[PDB]
């Protein structure tokens, strides 16, 4: 029809391209934060120029990220204006729209500023109940919350999916009045691959939580217990499965909060994992039919063999009782016992075959 159906596509491409730079500039800051946190503990102190450089980089990336977010929201407003048939952009503002933008800005505006600021930290040790005191730095409160920036991955994955950006799929969805949201794609992925998503989620959370616990716990720790990376991995793994704590209990409320979060997540996820595992152990239609065929084939032979022995024992009893001059009672008793055994076996086999046939009916 011209103009339209091309303007919407142009806006779609612009919005999709604006969502990659945000991911790049967020992951850059997270990686630089991790490297600086690791290095400043033992390699250099907090007064060197390396810290200043590595934090100026973070500030620059944060500024660019905020600019990109604002431009993305402007493009989204334009797309709404086109879609709903509006002439003034002020019709878009609906309170919650402002609230979500402010929340995104606040979440993405946190990072360790350059400088040298310290505070006082006290904790109560585990299993001995002895107070501790140290002078930490403010850059540990401002660094952990960067992991909240990981929501952009979901946005990118939603905008790059084939279901969201296929003309035929959109036409069918419009015909059936289907709203394409981020929950629809999540449910679709869960239906398609319910194991891969769980594996990826668990493997990422494991490492992130282990590093966070170690970083929190390295301050009040002089025995290499909870500051060990492998020890943190073991602690997270055994708390996920809800087994216990061992001798490794955190001395910090940060570690305890992390442990509570992993415990909740594991209690939520184990049931789904075992359900999808149980769903992988059944037979399809064709193999079920083959199995039933072979079972009936074997049961017929078993029932025939069982039925023969009854007549065999009856004949033996009659012969040894009436066709012999003298009577030997031991043989008669043995044959009667075997006769009863044959009757019971025949009845059991017949009942099992009837039950299987009724089930297959």
């Amino acid at each position: 029809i011209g103009y339209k159906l091309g303007h919407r596509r142009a806006l779609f491409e612009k919005r999709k391209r604006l969502s990659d730079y945000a991911l790049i500039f967020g992951m850059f800051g997270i990686v630089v934060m991790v490297i600086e946190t690791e290095l400043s503990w033992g390699a250099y102190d907090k007064a060197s120029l390396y810290s200043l450089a590595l934090k100026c980089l973070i500030s620059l990336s944060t500024i660019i990220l905020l600019g990109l977010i604002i431009v993305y929201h402007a493009r989204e407003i334009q797309l709404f204006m086109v879609d709903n048939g509006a002439d003034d952009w002020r019709i878009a503002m609906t309170y919650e729209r402002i609230f979500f933008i402010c929340l995104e800005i606040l979440v993405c505006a946190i990072h360790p500023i350059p400088g040298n600021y310290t505070f006082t930290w006290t904790a109560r040790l585990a299993f001995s109940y002895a107070p501790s005191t140290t002078t930490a730095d403010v850059d540990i409160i401002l660094s952990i919350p960067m992991f909240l920036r990981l929501y952009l991955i979901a946005r990118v994955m939603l905008l790059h999916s084939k279901l969201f950006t296929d003309a035929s799929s959109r036409s069918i969805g419009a015909l059936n009045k289907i709203n394409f949201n981020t929950r629809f794609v999540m449910k679709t992925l869960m239906t398609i691959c319910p194991g891969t998503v769980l594996l990826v989620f668990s493997i990422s959370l494991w490492i992130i939580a282990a590093w966070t616990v170690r970083a929190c716990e390295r301050y009040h720790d002089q025995q290499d217990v909870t500051s060990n990376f492998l020890g943190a991995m073991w602690l997270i793994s055994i708390t996920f499965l809800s087994i216990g704590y061992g001798d490794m209990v955190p001395n910090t409320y940060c570690g305890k909060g992390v442990c509570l979060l992993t415990g909740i997540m594991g209690a939520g996820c184990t049931a789904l994992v075992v359900a999808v595992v149980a769903r992988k152990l059944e037979l399809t239609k064709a193999e079920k039919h083959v199995h039933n065929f072979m079972m009936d084939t074997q049961l017929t032979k078993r029932v025939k063999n069982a039925a023969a022995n009854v007549l065999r024992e009856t004949w033996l009893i009659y012969k040894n009782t009436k066709l012999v001059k003298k009577i030997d009672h031991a043989k008669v008793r043995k044959h009667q016992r075997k006769f009863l055994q044959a009757i019971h076996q025949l009845r059991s086999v017949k009942m099992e075959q009837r039950k299987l046939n009724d089930q297959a009916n």
């Binding site: 025939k304 039925a307 023969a308 022995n309 009854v310 007549l311 065999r312 012969k319 009436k322 025949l346």
Partner: protein, 146 residues
Amino acid sequence: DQLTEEQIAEFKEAFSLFDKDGDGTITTKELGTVMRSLGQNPTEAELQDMINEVDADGNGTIDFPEFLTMMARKMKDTDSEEEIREAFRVFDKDGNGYISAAELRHVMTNLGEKLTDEEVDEMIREADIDGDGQVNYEEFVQMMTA
């Protein structure tokens, strides 16, 4: 010994389950409804045979003594008659009730724990009451008479 009046009332109450609309007699429909409510699919000929197997009166209906005899016989674990009458039907074909000697020889030579050739040969020699080679269930009662 014998029976006291205490279990007579209980047996009468049990008999009342089949015996609907009073009249103290069990008909084919009354038995059929009870067997239908238990999940089985009873044929008319099977019901007639079942009622006539116990009805020594021959009137086609069951009274209290006939029901008592039927229950007493059926409450046992193993009935040596029906148990070995079922085995023959297992090998029976077309429901004729007659088995030729060749099938018996093959069955008792190959299937089961097997017997020696002379033993099965003597068994078939005794089995045919006339020698036509078509044995039936009349010879069955020969080993159960005593």
